[PDB]
């Protein structure tokens, strides 16, 4: 039967699962988030198209349950993201990865990035004058760091983080940590 | 045409690309590494059987150049792993992600983990008595941890890391950093 194009899709599985780590270039991260977002409705439409064209009755076996589940699990996450956007109008709340945001007050501007999980201690490494707090490339900085950053969820829980202690390594590199000190419920 | 099974394949692009990273669960990480390793043999055989069955001449236009590429790359990425195993015999060098290892001398034994990149400064957080150095869950430890660790490449490189300074947070949490101090070429 058909073996070429179906095999070629397996090569994409090595493009993924190996390059999903991409957090160095911001453009790559944005393109990956966009790909993960626009792929959510595409996979639903194909399931419904397979379900409507009744063949061998398998379209009503698992092909109607699959589409229904992938729709009911999409609606809830979209409304949760809408709630997070309503709390903080940051436009990052519609990412398909997580519903926790991190705000970092750099020089004159505030940078918002998605956060996988909110914890008590957050690290910061400034290798060769290139700040990277939570694995996120935040730009170019030095040891002049901001002594207060913020983590925003949607169900209350505005967490304020304070600069613990910063050390300098090898001239221009460094390390620092932020520890939580205040919680404010919406 | 065929819509059900191929659409069901698009669901795997959300299970992967979203859950594929250096997650805390070591069993899941080993499972992901095993899946990544088992992937490569398939594409060779699949392309072999897609090119031998000459149909519409497409089996020679692209089914042999891509197969040759994916066959010649596997040999290099296998011989490099065998060289790294020759340097250090730890069985972790065969992972298809990276050829850099991190050795951490915990209580009694030594723990080896893959390392994406060797850097000058390495952080560590001990949230709620759960050590995690480079994003890898190393088990349960305290603030009284090891003052020397190593990073092993294969290109005649062994880097020694020395404990810079450790701080305690909220009773049983804390953070620490390691800075490189010696390089030894094999």
């Amino acid at each position, epitope marked *: 039967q058909w073996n070429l194009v179906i095999g070629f899709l397996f090569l994409t599985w090595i493009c993924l699962l190996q390059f999903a780590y991409a957090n160095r270039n911001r453009f790559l991260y944005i393109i990956k988030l966009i790909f993960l977002w626009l792929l959510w409705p595409v996979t639903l439409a194909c399931f419904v198209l397979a379900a409507v064209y009744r063949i061998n009755w398998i379209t009503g076996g698992i092909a109607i349950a699959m589409a229904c589940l992938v729709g009911l699990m999409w609606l809830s996450y979209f409304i949760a993201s809408f709630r997070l956007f309503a709390r903080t109008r940051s436009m990052w709340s519609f990412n398909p990865e997580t519903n926790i945001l991190l705000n970092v*007050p750099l*020089h*004159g501007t*505030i940078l918002t990035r998605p956060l996988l999980e909110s914890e*008590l201690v957050i690290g910061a490494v400034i290798l060769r004058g290139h700040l990277r707090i939570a694995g996120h490339h935040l730009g170019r900085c030095d040891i002049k760091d*901001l*002594p*207060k950053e913020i983590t925003v969820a949607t169900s209350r829980t505005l967490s*304020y983080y*304070k600069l*613990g*202690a910063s050390q300098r390594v090898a001239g221009d590199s460094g390390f620092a940590a932020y*520890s*939580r*000190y*205040r*919680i*404010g*419920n919406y | 045409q065929w819509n059900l099974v191929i659409g069901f394949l698009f669901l795997t692009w959300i299970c992967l690309l979203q859950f594929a990273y250096a997650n805390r669960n070591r069993f899941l990480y080993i499972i992901k590494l095993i899946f990544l390793w088992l992937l490569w043999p398939v594409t060779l055989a699949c392309f072999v059987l897609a090119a031998v069955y000459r149909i519409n001449w497409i089996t020679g236009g692209i089914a042999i150049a891509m197969a040759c590429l994916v066959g010649l790359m596997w040999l290099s990425y296998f011989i490099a792993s065998f060289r790294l195993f020759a340097r250090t015999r730890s069985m972790w060098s065969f992972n298809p992600e990276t050829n850099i290892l991190l050795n951490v001398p915990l209580h009694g034994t030594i723990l080896t983990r893959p390392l994406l990149e060797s850097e000058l400064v390495i952080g560590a957080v001990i949230l*709620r008595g759960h050590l995690r150095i480079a994003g890898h869950h190393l088990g349960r430890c305290d603030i009284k941890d090891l003052p020397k660790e190593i990073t092993v490449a294969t290109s005649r490189t062994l880097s020694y890391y020395k404990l810079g300074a450790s701080q*305690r*947070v*909220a*009773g049983d949490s804390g953070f620490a950093a390691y800075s490189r101090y010696r390089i030894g070429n094999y």
Partner: antibody
Amino acid sequence: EVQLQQSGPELVKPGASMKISCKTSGYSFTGYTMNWVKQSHGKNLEWIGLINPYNGDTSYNQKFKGKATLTVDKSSSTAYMELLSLTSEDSAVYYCEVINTYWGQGTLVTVSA
Amino acid sequence: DIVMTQSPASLAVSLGQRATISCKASQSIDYDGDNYMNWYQQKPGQPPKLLIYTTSNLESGIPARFSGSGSGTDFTLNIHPVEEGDAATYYCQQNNEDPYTFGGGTKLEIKR
């Protein structure tokens, strides 16, 4: 070297209003939270509210709502808490802080006719 | 509604001896698995000074003679090498809910 400088002691007739200033220096004005604290009738302290300079988002407590109003002027880096309908029980010292570590000098308010 | 009651009203301690203050919470200031609690020192004519900001973690530049401890609803502050330069008043704050309630205060007097 974060520094906060307040307005100064003021005398207000009962029933009037007052505006207090907390001009800041040494850091980028937007980024902190600028809590306001009140110390009255000796040595007991109370919390009034906070406000995010980047975009509004004031937050009070259920006791000082309708009595204090906080604004922000990003051009000159000042905070402008204002009290309304002052009475005899409104004379105290008002502080402004950022990260609970850097405080203002204080502002004595005397409400008497 | 989380009124905190520290009830040494005044306390006298000689040089070198150890002094303790026993601010206690009302019901449940232990959210998120950790207890948040600030300790302040205020001298006459100055704004309050932060010492300890989460039941622990003495602020940068503060001498190590101050130690904070406690859990549940009972918290303590300890100054073991009581010197002559600390004759201030000490406060406790919760930093957990909408009303960030302060403590009553405890005036530290030095015996001589």
